[PDB]
Write a protein that binds this ligand. Structure first.
Ligand SMILES: CCCCCCCCCCCCCC(=O)O
Ligand SMILES: CCCCCCCCCCCCCC(=O)O
Lengths: 283, 234, 68, 261, 283, 48, 68, 239, 68, 60
């Protein structure tokens, strides 16, 4: 038991007429200025017991963010059987707030907590009694077979992990350990998935550039587990993610502008992130 | 069965929850770590990096590279070179510096802020600039005399370059709110010529300086909040 | 095999000392085989800003002209 | 023994600078070789130290008063070097740290400043408005000849399969003023003729395929405008010279020859 | 055993003809009388095992009060879409019993427990089958973006903490640590947020005087998370607060009259708190 | 895992309830206290 | 790391000394990281009424004339 | 009695759950064990067994016994005799071997792979075969000159009928996907004649070689997944 | 009669030794009478590939000619 | 508490000009080949910390 480290305490000082004054320095080198108030003005002794808990990366990334919203429909119409089945790519790029926080680092390692929240309504103009619904969330690692339908054989989940949730119970949850094939997940990939060679045209590699073409973490397949009812039910499933046990490397500036897709592509109509000021001398 | 009683809070999902949960992949073998350069442990390590201030947001320079260029000139002037409100979280020009962008994920902050300036003009030119910070609640420092009453230093141009003025942590409060409330006001930062910058013959008369902002290592932030800077289509 | 550690200081928990008796402690037991199932790890306040703020090979001190 | 004077010798070549800013070692870590404890590939590596770790001068660029910036993919710009270049094509995997030296001389009557930033994973936006990450290999990896930054984004697909980059958003949507979070040094024509930045190999991997991935890029920006008193169009060259450090390679194959134009 | 200290026992005493007379004092001095029965009357010896527990400030403020009633409406009518969510200023001033107790002190410091209670009905003249509703409670601290709608992107909650509650599960609950800026919360502010300085307005300050002008704790944003149904659901949300771990300073009398607004304002119609007595000589 | 039984009193909200609860704002650095005069510990000190 | 302390006496002839019996104890274990999550604090009956009822520069004895 | 709180995840069913549960048959007496020869403790013990690969899966031989036979002529040729993609689950000939099959239940894998070749010609037939492996990110080898630049072994045909090459773990990553991928490219395995097979009179001029594949001791797999080699019709109860 | 054992490693974990710190331990208590009711067994990680890869009566060494 | 058994590590090696060559064998014997990379090519020392836990039958 001890007090956690605090930010710097200011030591009392006095006026200085020396030949060694920190206020004048150079930033041609890559260093930042190092001056603190005690170098510029007379200061009092201040005891500093304040700390930086909220800015620890573990705390910064300590919230479960919404990642995506998926939709299923329970329906007796043959034209809607396909709607009982929804496959989503695993990604964090569907929602912008989480993405910007992650985009601060070039590389990261973390375990991931996933939580799902279900909500449902009748999309119809008329409703009536329907049995409580059960939903199945199955993870299909890349290379595993995909179901062709909501009721196909792959849903038997012999190897693929899956979770069964009864609507109304506590939102379902599970922990995913770090799964990269690299020693860290990359948030950026300045390269191509394959090298196009001499015996290829000169437009070769156009669709192989970026993190987008290199990463594949499989998909999440979600289905209704009930058979169809006379009264249609629309189900919206929110998927949440919380990185935990997280380490990061090589900081980057955050994006100032709106994203176009999963890459770093810019929107021609939205490249003007700053507000105008009437003059340089306006406070 | 051990008698138990569920209390309020049962069967709810809090995005701030810190509970254990079953592994979806029991006995999974995690890829061994390697050392990677550039490890970051705390966001304040980034807050303390000097980054460039888009000081010039006049019409025609907004969202252009020139936003970071503060003009200086050989001609005589008694006017402020620039004026800035000390609101690193809500000010139009400071909110988008790295200090600002990190800070905008927080609701409150403390500690001092360093303002670093560098002259990129000719070696041949000399002069002295006044860098000054006045605490809030008084007439804005619209002239040199008021700039002298506040905290200030003189930047004497010569062999060295960069000069750092520090806006000390002066507040009534322990922390300041990020939101630009009247009771949050940080005060005023200005720069004035102390003396005319003198340009010798056959030397350009229009000069530029760059400004940078960073946290001092007494700086900290409190509650995490969604940042208002980013949006997306629904 | 439980572990005990100090709680974060509250409104009336102590001075910032986090050394105000046993009542400011809490207990955690891990219930799973897989470490990834553990609750968030202990806060690590270690930091080293010089990696990003002063990555200089020639180790100049602050109270000195940068250029000699 | 002034801090402004620096001499760096690698392999069989040397760079001497009379006036320079103190050299920067990114993230505080000097380039190293892979330790046995972290090795991925099993085969015995090759470490052609003198032949590889040799400073290689790249074709210079001109700094004009209208320039917006320049950029390079690092291991790519060196692919045109004899040694090192061939090793990237003969070996599947490789690792390389670098010493990057940027020089731009001017008389005392000149003004302007070049920020030199080293961007790990310098991922850039494409110049197509309807597609994402749509860039050909060739346009993405120009070799010794570097690219340039522009003032405005004008997407459109012969021009489409190309990178385009605003200088103020550094080609990816990030304001340039925060470029400074990256290892950097500034060449201030007023006080500093050159910059030296040393970088370790940085990746999520200990070693990677250099024909597919560029772990660092180089970004140079005219942070302060170039200017001169009596011409209104000074033209000062910028020369970039780079040497690999602590390099090593794994695997061996019939030399790979990439698609080119 | 920390046997709780009792109030004083009464010492038995006899009458005296002493010159030391504790009954005759002065109050001009700014002090209370000090007399107890043993000083003025013959007394019996009484052992006192009684204590002051319910009066400890922790006990006084130990209950969760209703603070406010918020309401949501889930309806398919387009004119009701804006009613799916409710933005509430964080405050305790919506409820008088709690304000009155808190206002016994000028300053206070406490952690806060917040609990919510949800209730619902059909507001229509025609009910029908509707799926279990789920609600999201999001905290939006000062300066954080506000949602423009019930389904806006800000509900991603990547940093803003939020609670997802399914109707019928145990009332949701969470703790809030002391979050004041000062070292105590103030219940009063005899001042202005800013000093008007030669602002060419002698009425300046009229819009920024008092406690309101210095308090911004963000808002509580509550939404239905379900899509609209043919049968409207009306939901009442009650917010409860319990200060805990509480210390207070600088006591003041409680307000005797009805509050008019968040400040100390009086309504002229209710400035007469006392009942009449027929005569000063009536027991 | 551990067999349990919910007793009456479960899943209820008592306004005088005194149980532990999760924190919505974790690892929060609480503004340190200062001495403020006029501290009151018990309502009875005002009654007197 | 459990905290054990005494209970407030109830109806069953609990001698008011509160040191009578071993069954008038209870156990609290803190489970959460932030102390703000803890149950209410321990009772503290210490009081300082003189701060409000008889603050005074020159201490007065109640048996002395208030004014001399 | 004991105050509690139900956390997220309560009352859910996860197929990867590991929890205790009441026994349906309390005190059931479980039949005492006996030792049975051949106990398997880990799937990797099977991954390391040499498996015959249906390399010659060409039209007319696919799903016949001949798919396991690599033809060889005495006649001189500069052509490769065979080529494989070193992608254990995506190369269709490789994906059905025991190694491929174990890997078809995993998403990610590591380690070196051994390729063993058995010559089944006459005793009187001699010659030399070149076996080689080139890493990814390269032009697939098309001739012997290219084969010579990659990793290779020359197998002198002789008293010992079998030899092997190991395709070492040469990868940028720690793990490669089992799944077909453009980034985690397998690399290339080929074989060329080093010299013609010399055959005396009244001796077969057309002979076969049998290739085998197995895991090396540094081999590992990481994420259990369903294998797309097996399918079933829709299941409906009580029809 | 609680069992305490070692957890499988996660991302923000110790080195590959997996025997560094107390933070990697977890607790298991069996609650039921039959062992069949217990949670899954501990990983064995024991193997003997020779049973299937080289069950040869005669002894061969790796560099030995297989046949002589 | 101890480190779990790992998969096989790689010993650094060099070219071998001896006549005892592990790459030449027989399978007629009913045995699998035994060669690993260090038997065929020059290799480096690799510390192998990988664990066959996913593949245990209990996990499978
Ligand atoms: C039964 C549900 C299991 C869910 C499995 C989720 C897999 C998470 C993959 C890793 C997250 C993406 C990392 C990245 O893109 O950098
Ligand atoms: C998940 C929802 C979290 C809701 C948090 C609301 C913020 C409460 C701040 C404390 C109350 C203001 C102080 C006061 O009563 O004077």
């Amino acid at each position: 038991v001890s007090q956690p480290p605090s930010t710097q305490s200011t030591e009392a000082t006095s006026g200085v007429n020396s030949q060694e004054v920190p206020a004048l320095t150079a930033v041609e080198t890559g260093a930042s200025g190092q001056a603190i108030p005690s170098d510029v003005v007379e200061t009092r002794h201040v005891v500093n017991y304040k700390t930086r808990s909220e800015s620890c990366l573990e705390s910064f990334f300590g919230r479960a963010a919404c990642v995506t919203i998926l939709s299923l429909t329970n329906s007796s119409k043959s034209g809607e059987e396909k709607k009982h089945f929804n496959i989503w790519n695993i990604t964090y790029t569907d929602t912008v707030q989480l993405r910007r926080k992650l985009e601060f680092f070039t590389y990261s390692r973390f375990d991931l907590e996933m939580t799902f929240v279900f909500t449902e309504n009748y999309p119809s103009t008329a409703s009536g009694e329907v049995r409580n619904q059960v939903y199945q969330i199955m993870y299909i690692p890349p290379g595993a077979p995909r179901p062709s339908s909501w009721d196909d054989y792959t849903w038997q989940s012999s190897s693929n992990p899956s979770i069964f949730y009864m609507y109304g119970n506590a939102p379902p949850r599970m922990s995913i350990p770090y799964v990269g094939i690299a020693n860290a997940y990359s948030h950026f990939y300045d390269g191509f998935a394959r090298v196009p060679l001499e015996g290829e045209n000169t437009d070769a590699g156009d669709t192989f550039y970026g993190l987008v073409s290199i990463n594949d973490f499989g998909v999440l397949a979600v289905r209704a587990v009930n058979r169809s009812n006379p009264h249609t039910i629309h189900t919206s499933v929110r998927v949440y993610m919380k990185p935990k046990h997280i380490r990061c490397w090589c900081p980057r500036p955050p994006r100032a502008v709106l994203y176009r897709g999963e890459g770093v592509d810019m929107i021609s109509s939205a490249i003007l992130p700053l507000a105008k000021v009437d003059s340089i001398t306006t406070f | 069965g051990l008698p138990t009683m569920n209390t309020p809070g049962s069967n709810q999902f809090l995005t701030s929850d810190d509970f254990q949960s079953p592994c979806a992949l029991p006995n999974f073998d995690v890829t061994p770590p390697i050392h990677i350069p550039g490890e970051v442990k705390n966001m304040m390590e980034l807050a303390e990096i000097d980054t460039l201030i888009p000081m010039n947001a006049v019409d025609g320079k907004v969202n252009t590279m020139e936003m970071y260029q503060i003009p200086l000139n050989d001609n005589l002037s008694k006017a402020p070179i620039f004026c800035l409100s000390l609101s690193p979280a809500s000010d139009k020009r400071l909110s988008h510096t790295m200090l600002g962008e990190i800070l905008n994920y927080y609701t409150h902050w403390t500690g001092s802020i360093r303002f670093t300036f560098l002259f990129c003009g000719s070696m041949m030119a000399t002069g002295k600039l006044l860098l000054s910070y006045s605490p809030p609640g008084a007439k804005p420092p619209t002239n040199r005399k008021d700039a002298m009453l506040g905290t200030h230093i003189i930047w004497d141009l010569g062999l060295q370059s960069s000069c750092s003025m520090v806006a000390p942590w002066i507040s009534n409060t322990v922390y300041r709110r990020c939101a630009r409330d009247d009771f949050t006001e940080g005060g005023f930062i200005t720069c004035f010529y102390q003396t005319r910058i003198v340009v010798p013959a056959s030397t350009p008369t229009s000069m530029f300086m760059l400004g940078f902002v960073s946290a001092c290592p007494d700086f900290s932030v409190r509650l995490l909040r969604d940042t208002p800077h980013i949006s997306q289509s629904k | 095999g439980a572990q005990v550690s100090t709680q974060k200081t509250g409104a009336h928990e102590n001075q910032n000392v986090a050394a105000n008796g046993s009542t400011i402690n809490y207990t955690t037991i891990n219930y799973y085989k897989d470490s990834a199932s553990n609750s968030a790890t202990r806060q690590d306040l270690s930091q080293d800003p010089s990696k990003f703020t002063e990555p200089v090979k020639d180790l100049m001190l602050k109270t000195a002209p940068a250029l000699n | 023994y002034s801090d402004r004077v620096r001499q760096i010798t690698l392999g069989n070549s040397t760079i001497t600078t009379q006036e320079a800013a103190n050299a920067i070692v990114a993230y505080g870590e000097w380039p190293t070789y892979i330790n046995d404890s972290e090795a991925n590939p099993v085969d015995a590596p090759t470490e052609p130290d003198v032949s590889s770790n040799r400073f290689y001068t790249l074709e210079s660029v001109s700094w004009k008063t209208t320039s917006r910036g320049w950029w390079w993919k690092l291991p790519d710009c060196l692919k045109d070097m004899g040694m090192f270049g061939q090793n990237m094509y003969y070996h599947y995997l490789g690792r390389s740290g670098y010493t990057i030296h940027v020089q731009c001389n001017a008389s005392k009557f000149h003004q302007g400043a070049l920020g030199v930033f080293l961007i790990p994973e310098f991922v850039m936006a494409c110049n197509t408005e309807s597609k994402t990450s749509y860039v050909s290999y060739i346009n993405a990896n120009p070799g010794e000849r570097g690219g340039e930054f522009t003032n405005t984004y004008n997407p459109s697909a012969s021009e489409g399969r190309k990178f385009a980059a605003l200088d103020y958003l550094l080609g990816s949507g990030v304001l340039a003023g925060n470029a400074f979070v990256y290892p950097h040094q500034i060449i201030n024509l007023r006080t500093n003729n050159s910059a030296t930045i040393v970088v370790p190999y940085v990746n999520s991997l200990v070693i990677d395929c250099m024909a597919k991935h560029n772990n660092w890029g180089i970004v140079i920006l005219p942070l302060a405008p170039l200017a001169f008193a009596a011409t209104s169009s000074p033209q000062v060259p910028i020369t970039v010279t780079i040497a690999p450090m602590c390099t090593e390679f794994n695997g061996l194959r019939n030399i790979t020859v990439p698609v080119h134009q």
